[PDB]
Design a protein around this motif. Sequence first.
Motif, PDB file in Angstrom:
ATOM      1  N   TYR A 131     -19.886  25.045 -32.052  1.00  0.00           N
ATOM      2  CA  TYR A 131     -18.485  24.950 -32.429  1.00  0.00           C
ATOM      3  C   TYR A 131     -17.576  24.949 -31.225  1.00  0.00           C
ATOM      4  CZ  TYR A 131     -19.956  25.972 -37.193  1.00  0.00           C
ATOM      5  OH  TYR A 131     -20.572  25.941 -38.423  1.00  0.00           O
ATOM      6  N   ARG A 132     -16.610  24.041 -31.266  1.00  0.00           N
ATOM      7  CA  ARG A 132     -15.660  23.800 -30.210  1.00  0.00           C
ATOM      8  C   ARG A 132     -14.284  23.932 -30.849  1.00  0.00           C
ATOM      9  NH1 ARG A 132     -17.816  19.349 -26.087  1.00  0.00           N
ATOM     10  NH2 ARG A 132     -19.189  21.180 -25.951  1.00  0.00           N
ATOM     11  N   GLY A 170     -10.419  27.328 -26.968  1.00  0.00           N
ATOM     12  CA  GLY A 170     -11.317  27.225 -25.830  1.00  0.00           C
ATOM     13  C   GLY A 170     -10.595  27.036 -24.512  1.00  0.00           C
ATOM     14  N   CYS A 171     -11.052  27.751 -23.485  1.00  0.00           N
ATOM     15  CA  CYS A 171     -10.551  27.555 -22.113  1.00  0.00           C
ATOM     16  C   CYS A 171     -10.738  26.092 -21.706  1.00  0.00           C
ATOM     17  CB  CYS A 171     -11.303  28.480 -21.140  1.00  0.00           C
ATOM     18  SG  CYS A 171     -10.969  28.200 -19.361  1.00  0.00           S
ATOM     19  N   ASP A 172     -11.863  25.518 -22.118  1.00  0.00           N
ATOM     20  CA  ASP A 172     -12.133  24.103 -21.929  1.00  0.00           C
ATOM     21  C   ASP A 172     -13.162  23.646 -22.944  1.00  0.00           C
ATOM     22  OD1 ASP A 172     -14.911  24.348 -20.785  1.00  0.00           O
ATOM     23  OD2 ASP A 172     -13.843  25.226 -19.067  1.00  0.00           O
ATOM     24  N   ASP A 229     -20.432  31.462 -26.271  1.00  0.00           N
ATOM     25  CA  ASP A 229     -19.429  32.125 -25.420  1.00  0.00           C
ATOM     26  C   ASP A 229     -18.606  33.197 -26.128  1.00  0.00           C
ATOM     27  OD1 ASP A 229     -19.869  30.531 -22.900  1.00  0.00           O
ATOM     28  OD2 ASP A 229     -19.144  28.900 -24.195  1.00  0.00           O
ATOM     29  N   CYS A 230     -18.915  33.481 -27.393  1.00  0.00           N
ATOM     30  CA  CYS A 230     -18.222  34.564 -28.095  1.00  0.00           C
ATOM     31  C   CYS A 230     -18.310  35.857 -27.274  1.00  0.00           C
ATOM     32  CB  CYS A 230     -18.835  34.790 -29.479  1.00  0.00           C
ATOM     33  SG  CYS A 230     -17.897  35.970 -30.487  1.00  0.00           S
ATOM     34  N   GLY A 231     -17.183  36.522 -27.052  1.00  0.00           N
ATOM     35  CA  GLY A 231     -17.210  37.796 -26.305  1.00  0.00           C
ATOM     36  C   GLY A 231     -17.130  37.656 -24.792  1.00  0.00           C
ATOM     37  N   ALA A 252     -13.642  32.593 -21.528  1.00  0.00           N
ATOM     38  CA  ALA A 252     -13.820  31.314 -22.219  1.00  0.00           C
ATOM     39  C   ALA A 252     -12.755  31.021 -23.285  1.00  0.00           C
ATOM     40  CB  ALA A 252     -15.216  31.221 -22.830  1.00  0.00           C
ATOM     41  N   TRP A 253     -11.871  31.979 -23.539  1.00  0.00           N
ATOM     42  CA  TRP A 253     -10.997  31.898 -24.719  1.00  0.00           C
ATOM     43  C   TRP A 253      -9.551  32.249 -24.444  1.00  0.00           C
ATOM     44  CZ3 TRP A 253     -13.535  29.047 -27.914  1.00  0.00           C
ATOM     45  CH2 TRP A 253     -14.941  29.130 -27.926  1.00  0.00           C
TER      46      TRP A 253
END
Length: 82
Positions: free
Chosen positions: A22-23, A28-30, A64-66, A70-71
């Motif tokens: 999932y995107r 998202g940072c990117d 990348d959760c957590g 990344a967020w």
Amino acid sequence: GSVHKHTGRNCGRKFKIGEPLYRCHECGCDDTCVLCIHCFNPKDHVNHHVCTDICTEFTSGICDCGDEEAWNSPLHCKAEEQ
Ligand SMILES: [Zn+2]
Ligand SMILES: [Zn+2]
Ligand SMILES: [Zn+2]
């Protein structure tokens, strides 16, 4: 369902063949920033442009959760829900 919580750290789950990555354009940072099925919380992304990729030999990675770097916005990991 039964799903592992990763409270206090990142998920980092390696995707399995056939699984969605999932995107979220807004969160998202990117576009390399991805969430697994354990983690992706549709409620975080109601008003957002979300897309899935599917894991193959050439498309892989880790959730990348957590990982706060990344967020853009706070995520509410689905695994944490009761
Ligand atoms: Zn995850
Ligand atoms: Zn998570
Ligand atoms: Zn989002």
